[PDB]
Design a protein around this nucleic acid. Sequence first.
DNA 1: CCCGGACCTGTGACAAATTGCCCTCAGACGG
DNA 2: GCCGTCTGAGGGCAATTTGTCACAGGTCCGG
Length: 212
Amino acid sequence: NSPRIVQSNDLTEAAYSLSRDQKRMLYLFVDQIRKSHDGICEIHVAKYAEIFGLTSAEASKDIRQALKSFAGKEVVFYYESFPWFIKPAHSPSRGLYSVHINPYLIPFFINRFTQFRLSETKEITNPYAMRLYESLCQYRKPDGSGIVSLKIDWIIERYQLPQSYQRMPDFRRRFLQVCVNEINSRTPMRLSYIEKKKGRQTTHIVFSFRDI
DNA sequence: CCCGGACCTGTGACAAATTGCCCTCAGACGG
DNA sequence: GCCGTCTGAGGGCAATTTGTCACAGGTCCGG
Ligand SMILES: [Mg+2]
Ligand SMILES: [Mg+2]
Ligand SMILES: [Mg+2]
Ligand SMILES: [Mg+2]
């Protein structure tokens, strides 16, 4: 009975770089906006702690540092670039934060759409594994299975992977294998994949999955 | 031919970053 | 009105994970 996140495919497939803590906050903003026109959201420390099973102290640390790391962050929809925030965050009351999302982002948030319950993702740690799990949901069938081929260059561009993952053996070891292992251990999805080649170069990854 | 060279793979090392933990002390509130 | 408790805003930590690069070791091309 946990919150059902839905988002436009354009966000699933946008180019940006966010941490886990920021992505966690981002799911609730999308939830708040959708339940309504101006872009102003709010986060309560004690509620965040209860959702993600943290203490109040570590929640406060997570929100505060996440919040100041949004500055200068930009989002690209393929292209068009936007800042996420147009005013610094601020706290009117103790245990409470108020934030100002770029109102021009509203239409990008909200029948080409992606949807998942928040409990599916709340134990994932690596933000790239959150990105991969969202793109797979975009292709999921009602029953819970799907199959899709993602191109390696597009993965690198959209998820803004760091430069050393342009060497394929590092791509495998520190991104692909790790995020496939997390999904299989931390979500209800059971995931497999295979590599597509052209000559000596590996060009796509083909993902298949079913539901537990 | 065999060479040096341009590709590809995986692993061992080390540097940089993130994780859940731990401790202090004042704010807000109610009994 | 004061004070005890529930909060959360600060300061830190060591153990793991993520990001980078050298080197070993495969193939095929062409002079
Ligand atoms: Mg933290
Ligand atoms: Mg080649
Ligand atoms: Mg040997
Ligand atoms: Mg050699």
